[PDB]
Design an enzyme around this catalytic site. Sequence first.
Site, PDB file in Angstrom:
ATOM      1  N   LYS A  51       0.811  -1.214   0.000  1.00  0.00           N
ATOM      2  CA  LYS A  51       0.000   0.000   0.000  1.00  0.00           C
ATOM      3  C   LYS A  51       0.853   1.277   0.000  1.00  0.00           C
ATOM      4  O   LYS A  51       0.405   2.340  -0.444  1.00  0.00           O
ATOM      5  CB  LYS A  51      -0.941  -0.012   1.209  1.00  0.00           C
ATOM      6  CG  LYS A  51      -2.199   0.837   1.042  1.00  0.00           C
ATOM      7  CD  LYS A  51      -3.110   0.669   2.256  1.00  0.00           C
ATOM      8  CE  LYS A  51      -4.422   1.414   2.106  1.00  0.00           C
ATOM      9  NZ  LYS A  51      -4.217   2.866   1.870  1.00  0.00           N
ATOM     10  N   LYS A  63      -6.567  -7.579  -1.135  1.00  0.00           N
ATOM     11  CA  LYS A  63      -6.423  -8.685  -2.071  1.00  0.00           C
ATOM     12  C   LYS A  63      -5.050  -9.338  -1.920  1.00  0.00           C
ATOM     13  O   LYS A  63      -4.930 -10.562  -1.864  1.00  0.00           O
ATOM     14  CB  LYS A  63      -6.676  -8.183  -3.497  1.00  0.00           C
ATOM     15  CG  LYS A  63      -8.167  -7.930  -3.764  1.00  0.00           C
ATOM     16  CD  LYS A  63      -8.452  -7.121  -5.021  1.00  0.00           C
ATOM     17  CE  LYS A  63      -9.882  -7.361  -5.554  1.00  0.00           C
ATOM     18  NZ  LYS A  63     -10.960  -6.888  -4.642  1.00  0.00           N
TER      19      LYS A  63
HETATM   20 NA    NA Z   1      -0.399   3.570  -2.287  1.00  0.00          NA
END
Ligand code: NA
EC number: 2.7.7.7
Length: 326
Positions: A51, A63
């Site tokens: 992320k 996911k």
């Molecule tokens: Na990001």
Amino acid sequence: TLNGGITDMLTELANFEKNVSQAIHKYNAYRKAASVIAKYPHKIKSGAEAKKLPGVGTKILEKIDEFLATGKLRKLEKIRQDDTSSSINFLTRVSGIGPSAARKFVDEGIKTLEDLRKNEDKLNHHQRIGLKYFGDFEKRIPREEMLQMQDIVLNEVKKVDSEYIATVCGSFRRGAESSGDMDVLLTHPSFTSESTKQPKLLHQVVEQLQKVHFITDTLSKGETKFMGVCQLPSKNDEKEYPHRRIDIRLIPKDQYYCGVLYFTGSDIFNKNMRAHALEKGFTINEYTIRPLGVTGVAGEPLPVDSEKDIFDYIQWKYREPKDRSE
DNA sequence: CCGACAGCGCATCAGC
DNA sequence: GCTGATGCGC
DNA sequence: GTCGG
Ligand code: NA
Ligand SMILES: Cc1cn([C@H]2C[C@H](O)[C@@H](COP(=O)(O)OP(=O)(O)[C@H](F)P(=O)(O)O)O2)c(=O)[nH]c1=O
Ligand SMILES: [Mg+2]
Ligand code: NA
Ligand code: NA
């Protein structure tokens, strides 16, 4: 390929969103994520870690945790089992069949390779050649073969007119050991942003390549873009080379550096760079880079003497072709 | 939030 | 036919 | 689906 599993998963998700959902921004979002992760030089151990990368948000992060935990993705398992999605996804693998034709064919009960062959008369020309060379177009081209194809194209082009310049782009110019097809940028001093002092500049080249039986089929042809099929010649008793996709793009000679930037790619590199252009207040296409002024309207073409000039304008350090494989 | 997300050639079609 | 939209592919 | 403002 540190994160082969994850990037595969995302690619499959992207293909589903494009082919089946017809949601082209999800397609591009997933493809962006796949790319930024593919060049990330650590093996990803967490969705959260992923992320941190731009293009990866919450959804893809969840996911990734799932995939890491189980080695699979439930969402993809279900899609794989669904017959309508699987058929649609398959039919889009024929060149010329997109998401709309694929769904139209499935609705007609045309959903396998044999169905297409059995219904060849319900296909346009492109789709027909795509079907003819379905197996062949799935095969990669080793660089050793690209080099032979280069030899042929450049020499044949030189016979037609020695003032042609033909340049092989695509992953070949980025130095890849294999390519999906051949991309050829063509210039001639007759054709500039000023005048077209000579017609059929593209036709004459195509014609010659057909004459020597290098080009075997046409997918589409206009005055500046040819898309078709070609094949290396094989020797006595030798099995024939597969047929290959070839594209030829004739660009105004004074617009070469924008053209060769475009056709060298990658596609995702092109998208990133053009996006960054916009942020910097320029717009770039295969012809020009132009300033975007006040109202968003494109201004006049800025002068370009190199690929690096284009990079300079948008304040990016120059990246060699081989570092553009995004 | 939410608007934007790269840019374009050629083929095919709808409507005129 | 021309024009504009859409599909598909780069 | 992600993201910058
Ligand atoms: Na990001
Ligand atoms: C598909 C695509 C391609 N391109 C440019 C960038 C590509 O490098 C160039 C050739 O397209 P390609 O699909 O053959 O991709 P490539 O870079 O040549 C692949 F690596 P290869 O065909 O060698 O497997 O066209 C774009 O600008 N936008 C796109 O959407
Ligand atoms: Mg290529
Ligand atoms: Na297709
Ligand atoms: Na190509």
